[PDB]
Amino acid sequence: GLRQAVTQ
Amino acid sequence: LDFALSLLRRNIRQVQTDQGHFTMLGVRDRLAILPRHSQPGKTIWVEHKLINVLDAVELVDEQGVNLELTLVTLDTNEKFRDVTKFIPETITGASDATLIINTEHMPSMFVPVGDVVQYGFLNLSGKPTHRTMMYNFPTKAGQAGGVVTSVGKIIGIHIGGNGRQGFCAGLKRGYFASE
Numbered sequence: 639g640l641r642q643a644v645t646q
Numbered sequence: 647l648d649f650a651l652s653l654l655r656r657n658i659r660q661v662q663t664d665q666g667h668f669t670m671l672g673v674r675d676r677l678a679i680l681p682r683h684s685q686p687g688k689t690i691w692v693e694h695k696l697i698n699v700l701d702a703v704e705l706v707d708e709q710g711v712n713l714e715l716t717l718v719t720l721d722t723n724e725k726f727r728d729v730t731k732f733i734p735e736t737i738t739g740a741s742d743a744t745l746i747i748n749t750e751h752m753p754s755m756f757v758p759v760g761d762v763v764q765y766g767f768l769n770l771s772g773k774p775t776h777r778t779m780m781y782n783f784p785t786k787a788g789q790a791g792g793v794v795t796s797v798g799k800i801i802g803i804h805i806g807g808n809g810r811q812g813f814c815a816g817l818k819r820g821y822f823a824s825e
Contacts, residue, residue, distance in 0.1 A: 641767055643770050643813050646805070646807045
């Protein structure tokens with residue numbers, strides 16, 4: 639659950 | 647702030663696609679750059695004018711992994727002044743960067759993201775992504791496409807965030823080599 643993000 | 651100021655005026659435009667509002671950097675002549683997830687396509691709205699997109703190239707690496715960048719050639723007489731000389735030859739971090747945002751909802755806005763570090767792999771909304779950099783600032787929705795600048799350099803394009811951190815796609819001058 640790391641190196642994660644969502645488009646913004 | 648002179649650089650960021652002159653870059654906003656000459657080069658940074660308010661844009662809309664089917665995916666919403668984005669910030670767009672005009673690189674040179676009719677070439678501009680957008681975050682890939684903005685999915686420009688055949689047309690975009692630039693400052694409320696409906697413009698045709700003559701060409702759209704999505705940047706991937708030698709293994710075909712997303713770089714989250716889309717080079718667009720716009721159908722317009724307007725020419726962007728060449729800013730490739732402010733884009734470093736290799737993807738480099740920075741100190742005290744300013745994230746430049748310019749959309750109808752967030753117009754002409756400077757965001758003090760601070761330090762910008764090499765980050766590398768990022769799973770952006772379920773999509774593997776490479777060559778990213780990171781800043782410890784709570785970036786929010788509607789800031790994608792934002793231009794990350796530092797000391798007269800254009801080092802990245804904002805693409806995403808995880809609540810406490812912001813991420814950008816690294817910028818190489820090589821991406822913009824002529825044909």
